[PDB]
Design an enzyme around this catalytic site. Structure first.
Site, PDB file in Angstrom:
ATOM      1  N   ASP A 151      -9.834  -5.368   9.410  1.00 50.32           N
ATOM      2  CA  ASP A 151      -8.466  -5.528   8.922  1.00 50.32           C
ATOM      3  C   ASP A 151      -8.448  -6.486   7.735  1.00 50.32           C
ATOM      4  O   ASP A 151      -8.476  -7.708   7.910  1.00 50.32           O
ATOM      5  CB  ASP A 151      -7.561  -6.028  10.041  1.00 50.32           C
ATOM      6  CG  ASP A 151      -6.103  -5.989   9.663  1.00 50.32           C
ATOM      7  OD1 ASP A 151      -5.804  -5.658   8.497  1.00 50.32           O
ATOM      8  OD2 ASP A 151      -5.257  -6.276  10.535  1.00 50.32           O
ATOM      9  N   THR A 152      -8.365  -5.925   6.527  1.00 54.60           N
ATOM     10  CA  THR A 152      -8.239  -6.734   5.321  1.00 54.60           C
ATOM     11  C   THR A 152      -6.896  -7.447   5.238  1.00 54.60           C
ATOM     12  O   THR A 152      -6.761  -8.402   4.465  1.00 54.60           O
ATOM     13  CB  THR A 152      -8.421  -5.861   4.081  1.00 54.60           C
ATOM     14  OG1 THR A 152      -7.397  -4.857   4.048  1.00 54.60           O
ATOM     15  CG2 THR A 152      -9.786  -5.194   4.088  1.00 54.60           C
ATOM     16  N   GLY A 153      -5.900  -7.002   6.000  1.00 55.88           N
ATOM     17  CA  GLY A 153      -4.605  -7.647   6.008  1.00 55.88           C
ATOM     18  C   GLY A 153      -4.483  -8.838   6.927  1.00 55.88           C
ATOM     19  O   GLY A 153      -3.437  -9.492   6.944  1.00 55.88           O
TER      20      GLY A 153
END
Ligand code: 017
Lengths: 99, 99
Positions: A25-27
């Site tokens: 998850d880059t967020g």
């Protein structure tokens, strides 16, 4: 490897001698895992997103293995609906976004 | 480009003729933007995040430009803490994770 985004980027991880599925998850600023009974000291923390906040336990210097790549850093534990690998560990495995 | 994850993967998007900053979020199935005025019809929908569910307006087939790359798809508008670009659009611009 290269992971396309047609489906959720779920991979197998190893933490505390347990195998789990987790979202790359880059967020997410920091890794947060579903409730589990990790040993060691921890500090309370609250993290927010869509829907509001959840209370989590912040463990430090936790070893996680992500698709054979080893990483060590902060791991939050709380009532998240999904295991989430965040940027704090994604950087340690050499993960990048590419388009 | 190749984006490392030491900082938040924030980029400039163009939607409805307006520029905004948005987070490339591989952990989001859908794209959710902060409150704004968008032309076209919309239906009420619900999305769940780490903290629960929120009420959003669903706009279908919306043009949105992400670092020059064009995409057309669903855009949810509601009280999200940050503009997030989800996989529904990340796939259109050919985005992949690589480690
Ligand atoms: C909202 C973001 C800025 C931050 N989030 C990461 C994000 O990827 C979440 C991560 C996520 C993923 C699944 C369930 C809960 C949270 N995805 C998400 O909210 O997506 C929603 C829109 O599309 C739908 O697809 C999934 C949920 C919906 S977060 O879960 O709240 C979060 C916040 C802080 C930390 N340290 C770790 C995670």
């Amino acid at each position: 490897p290269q992971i396309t985004l047609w489906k959720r980027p779920l991979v197998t991880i190893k933490i505390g001698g347990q195998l789990k599925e987790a979202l790359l998850d880059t967020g997410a600023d920091d890794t947060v895992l579903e409730e589990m009974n990790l040993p060691g000291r921890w500090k309370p923390k609250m993290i927010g997103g869509i829907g509001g906040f959840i209370k989590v336990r912040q463990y430090d210097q936790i070893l996680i293995e992500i698709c054979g790549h080893k990483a060590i850093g902060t791991v939050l534990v709380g009532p998240t609906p999904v295991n989430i690998i965040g940027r704090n560990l994604l950087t340690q495995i050499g993960c990048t976004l590419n388009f």
